[PDB]
């Protein structure tokens, strides 16, 4: 199932979306891995054959 919803994670104190206040971070974050990182931080082109 594909999910491309760009809403706000509504689970904190102040209700998100209806108003902007606290505990309303952005769900879709940006990664940022770099060659100077460790082995566990390197990306891998995972290909799943179903």
């Amino acid at each position: 199932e594909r999910d491309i919803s760009t809403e706000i994670y509504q689970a904190g104190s102040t209700p998100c979306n209806g108003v902007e206040g606290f505990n309303c971070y952005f769900p879709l974050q940006s990664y940022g891995f770099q060659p100077t990182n460790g082995v566990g931080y390197q990306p891998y082109r995972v290909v799943v054959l179903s």
Partner: protein, 50 residues
């Protein structure tokens, strides 16, 4: 859990343990470290600062 959605604190965060799981979770001992600092020193008190 009654003080999370109260919206009466400037900074009410929880590290490690989720703030929505302490409603029915048991704890062995709970400590209280009350101290007064500056405004920019709030970010220093966090697991992973210097």
């Amino acid at each position: 859990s009654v003080l999370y959605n109260s919206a009466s604190f400037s900074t009410f965060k929880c590290y490690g343990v989720s703030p929505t799981k302490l409603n029915d979770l048991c704890f062995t001992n709970v400590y209280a470290d009350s101290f007064v600092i500056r405004g920019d020193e709030v970010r220093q008190i966090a697991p992973g600062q210097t």
